[PDB]
Amino acid sequence: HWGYGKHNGPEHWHKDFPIAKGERQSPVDIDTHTAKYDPSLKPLSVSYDQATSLRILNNGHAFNVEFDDSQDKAVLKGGPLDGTYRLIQFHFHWGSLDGQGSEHTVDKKKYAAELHLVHWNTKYGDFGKAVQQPDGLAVLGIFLKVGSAKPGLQKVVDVLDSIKTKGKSADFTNFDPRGLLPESLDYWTYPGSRTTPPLLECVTWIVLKEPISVSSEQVLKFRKLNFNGEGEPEELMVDNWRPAQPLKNRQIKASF
Ligand SMILES: CC(=O)Nc1nnc(S(N)(=O)=O)s1
């Protein structure tokens, strides 16, 4: 199936997922001069004080940190959203080099990595149902630049050796996502899709303006993961990003 390789990479996803060449596809380039400052855009409201991280697993495309979304424990509201969205997981997209890795670009500028905190709209009941609606999901995007280490990310980094290959999982309790947020909650928002197959057009994208800095050694640790399953030839988990897609009409609004 699908991957990020020369033979199963993003350029091929359309054959199995036609919606690949759809109308509200993601990621896109954020043209800062074209973005529309919308003064009706309310400030974001991140209520992650009561979060319950459960596990960490390598799905073969990336690593996901799962959360308990059986109650309004970690939710997202305000900004451009209507209703409450519950955190289900977070994952990253990163490159083989420090000059590539993010999915979204800024004025064509590519970052080291990109953090995606995924939330689903509760009025829909379950995540499965949420992916059936135009306003099903809300993804908070955070850019990572290489510089000073991110204390709040070390917990994550130090467990990666336990989930090296595809299918491996590990208990990952008492992780506080708050440690991954920048100081400013200023953002750009637009209507898009999931950036990996089934590529469903259910996402309200929220990309933060201010990047977070992580050290070389932290990002390096990401790059040691394997796409492959245990007992197979090693294929380093690098460049797990999708190229920016055509905006196609859509307007990118700014909260600033
Ligand atoms: C279950 C779930 O949400 N999976 C996702 N996979 N990619 C996502 S992304 N990068 O488009 O936020 S969400």
Ligand SMILES: [Hg+2]
């Ligand atoms: Hg949808």
Ligand SMILES: [Zn+2]
């Ligand atoms: Zn993602």
